[PDB]
Design a protein around this ligand. Structure first.
Ligand SMILES: Cc1nc(Cc2ccc(F)cc2)c(O)c(C(=O)NCC(=O)O)n1
Ligand SMILES: [Fe+2]
Length: 209
């Protein structure tokens, strides 16, 4: 499926109706496990600062760059059709590792105070993942509805959801190494407002004395 067809037929319609969207088999087995290798390479060489921020052009991060390009393409076809949002940019790629010792992440909202991020995009890298045993379910609690969404961190799966208070979510305890890559997309207007009240942007960068 072309990017234009996945945006206009699956992602945008789904986002505007539910605000939670799952695209399985996004890149394919061969590209998927290439990313899996590059992600494991970040751990082997010990670049995990376990989260680490990747730009996509770094050596040995070519396929992660491909993923980021593929993600951008997809949003680029969505632009001006997602609510009343104008995506004007994104964060770098957050590569995250749940070590598999029974750690998870408590219920939270990604962007509760309007720091500019409107869409969370997550790519999962976990082959043959069975949540019944290994855990690691992402549970989203969509605002208003009397029901939750359960999302397995299934290999080669791409997830979109609104970053704001509409989508509180938790990562349940994981008993197996659990890998994901996240990018957040910025709305022009909210980002403009954010840059005015919060220590975000270029100005939010530490300088040494
Ligand atoms: C704001 C935030 N930050 C992190 C970074 C982090 C990773 C590991 C960790 F242990 C502690 C923090 C997240 O992972 C998530 C999230 O919703 N993840 C869903 C998923 O990966 O399915 N949200
Ligand atoms: Fe989150």
């Amino acid at each position: 499926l072309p990017a234009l067809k996945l945006a206009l037929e699956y992602i945008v319609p789904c986002m505007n109706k539910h605000g939670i969207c799952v695209v399985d088999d996004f890149l394919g087995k061969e590209t998927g496990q290439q990313i899996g290798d590059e992600v494991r390479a970040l751990h082997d060489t010990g670049k995990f600062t376990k989260i680490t921020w990747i730009e996509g052009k770094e050596p040995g991060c070519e396929t992660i760059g491909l993923l980021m390009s593929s993600m951008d393409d997809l949003i680029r076809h969505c632009n001006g059709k997602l609510g009343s949002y104008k995506i004007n940019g994104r964060t770098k790629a957050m590569v995250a590792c749940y070590p598999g010792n029974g750690t998870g992440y408590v219920r939270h909202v990604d962007n509760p105070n309007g720091d500019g991020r409107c869409v969370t995009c997550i790519y999962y890298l976990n082959k043959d993942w069975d949540a019944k045993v290994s855990g690691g379910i992402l549970r989203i609690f969509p605002e208003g509805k009397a029901q939750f969404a359960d999302i397995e961190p299934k290999f080669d799966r791409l997830l979109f959801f609104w970053s704001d208070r509409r989508n509180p979510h938790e990562v349940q305890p994981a008993y197996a190494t659990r890998y994901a890559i996240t990018v957040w997309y910025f709305d022009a207007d909210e980002r403009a407002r954010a840059k005015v009240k919060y220590l975000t942007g270029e100005k939010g960068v530490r300088v040494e004395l």
